[PDB]
Amino acid sequence: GMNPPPPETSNPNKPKRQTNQLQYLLRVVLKTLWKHQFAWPFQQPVDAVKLNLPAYYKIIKTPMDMGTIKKRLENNYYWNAQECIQDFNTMFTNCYIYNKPGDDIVLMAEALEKLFLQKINELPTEE
Numbered sequence: 001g002m003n004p005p006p007p008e009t010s011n012p013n014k015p016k017r018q019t020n021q022l023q024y025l026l027r028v029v030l031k032t033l034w035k036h037q038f039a040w041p042f043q044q045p046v047d048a049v050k051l052n053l054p055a056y057y058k059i060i061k062t063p064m065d066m067g068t069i070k071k072r073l074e075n076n077y078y079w080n081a082q083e084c085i086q087d088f089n090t091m092f093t094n095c096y097i098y099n100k101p102g103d104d105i106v107l108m109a110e111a112l113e114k115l116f117l118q119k120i121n122e123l124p125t126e127e
């Protein structure tokens with residue numbers, strides 16, 4: 001079968017701006033997760049064809065991954081930090097929704113999410 005198109009990373013119709021919080025989300029949060037030993041499955045959209053997961057995109061109707069988030073941050077796609085935080089949370093949630101407790105991939109997501117939470121705890125005040 002086929003994969004869906006990836007999430008958009010550009011949209012001139014969507015308002016955006018740079019903020020110090022979004023800068024932190026790139027320089028601290030994304031960078032910390034991206035380098036993690038368990039980042040690799042999350043660095044690009046799930047290829048449900050090569051991974052033989054034909055039900056993946058029946059189950060997961062809002063796909064998200066850090067490759068997409070990285071591009072969105074580098075392109076200044078977002079209006080606010082909450083939009084980006086939501087993309088991270090959607091990514092983790094998708095993994096937990098599709099898979100089962102204790103699966104390796106869930107353990108990987110949990111390791112990344114722990115770090116994500118530690119970093120967003122110190123999101124700076126907007127200025």
Ligand SMILES: Cc1sc2c(c1C)C(c1ccc(Cl)cc1)=N[C@@H](CC(=O)Nc1ccc(O)cc1)c1nnc(C)n1-2
Binds near residue numbers: 042046047051053095
């Ligand atoms: C490139 C990607 S994306 C990505 C993965 C991979 C290999 C990995 C994944 C599984 C284990 C490890 Cl150690 C690393 C990544 N897991 C998939 C889900 C999956 O395929 N599960 C599965 C497992 C065994 C089996 O016989 C049949 C299906 C998944 N579910 N969410 C994501 C993300 N991923």
